[PDB]
Design a protein around this ligand. Structure first.
Ligand SMILES: CC1(C)SCCN(S(=O)(=O)c2ccc(OCC#CCN)cc2)[C@H]1C(=O)NO
Ligand SMILES: [Zn+2]
Length: 259
């Protein structure tokens, strides 16, 4: 049975200056509200999911803390930060290499990451080949690094404890803002990774249904559009992975749903 005291993964949500400016129109209230609403809509998907196809449901996400970054992180030569104006490594391209950004983020945000189930970055940059987000995949293993629940690993190079309870979402793609319903999907998918799911096996009928059958599920390896009914749901494949991870990890860092 679910523990009503341990059914909610509380988030740190960060908006960088690219998100603030383009998505939030350079207004704290707009940015803040957009993200509060997005997460609440992603929460409705999670909370309503029955992970064992019976009564293991009511698991969700809520914002512990939001951080809004109004202007770029001023950076010295040879220096880098996830909120810096420059795209790393190629400063000519509009966007970072996504893996490097999540790594930079996890590194820069480490102190705050330690207090939360998950940290999520929201940005506004155009990643190569239509990439929209990235996140560490969670696991039932206590020893595991990645996904739900802060687990320190010492980094000799970074001179500190790091945490891999992190993920990112971008709302820009192919030169334009993506649909609202697409943004819900990216964050659902990336948090899906955090919660223990790998990508759906692409030839498996049950976990990758044909269009007549409702279309693909949200962990499909190629971005679903949101036009089809299955697109915002989790497959049995994802359910099984996430179920195990929640079973193990809820006790560790899940909290009570707040009003
Ligand atoms: C690391 C990856 C390049 S591997 C290939 C899939 N993507 S992605 O194209 O950026 C992507 C795909 C689907 C997503 O969510 C559903 C949606 C939508 C809106 N159309 C989000 C990102 C990344 C990946 O696996 N990230 O976890
Ligand atoms: Zn993915």
């Amino acid at each position: 049975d679910p523990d009503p005291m341990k059914n909610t993964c509380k988030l740190l949500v960060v908006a960088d200056h690219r998100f603030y400016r383009y998505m939030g129109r350079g207004e704290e209230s707009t940015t803040t509200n957009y993200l509060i609403e997005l997460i609440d809509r992603v929460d409705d998907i999670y909370r309503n999911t029955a992970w064992d196809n019976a009564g293991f449901k009511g698991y969700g996400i809520q914002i512990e803390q939001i951080r809004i970054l109004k202007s770029p992180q001023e950076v010295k030569p040879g220096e880098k930060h996830y909120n810096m104006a420059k795209s790393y490594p190629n400063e000519e391209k509009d966007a970072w290499d996504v893996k490097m950004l999540l790594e930079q983020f996890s590194f820069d945000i480490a102190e705050e990451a330690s207090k939360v189930c998950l940290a999520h970055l929201f940005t506004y940059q155009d990643f190569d080949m239509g990439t929209l987000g990235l996140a560490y995949v969670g696991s039932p293993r206590a020893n595991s690094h990645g996904g739900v629940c802060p687990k320190a690993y010492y980094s000799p190079v970074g001179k500190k404890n790091i945490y891999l309870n992190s993920g990112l979402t971008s709302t820009k793609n192919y030169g334009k803002t993506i649909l609202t319903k697409e943004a819900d999907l990216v964050t659902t998918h990336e948090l899906g990774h955090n919660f223990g799911a790998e990508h759906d096996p692409d030839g498996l009928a049950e976990c990758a249904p044909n269009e007549d059958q409702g279309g693909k599920y949200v962990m499909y390896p190629i971005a679903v559009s949101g036009d089809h009914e299955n697109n915002k749901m989790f497959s049995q494949c994802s359910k099984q992975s996430i179920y195990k991870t929640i079973e193990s990890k809820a006790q560790e860092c899940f909290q009570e749903r707040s009003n």
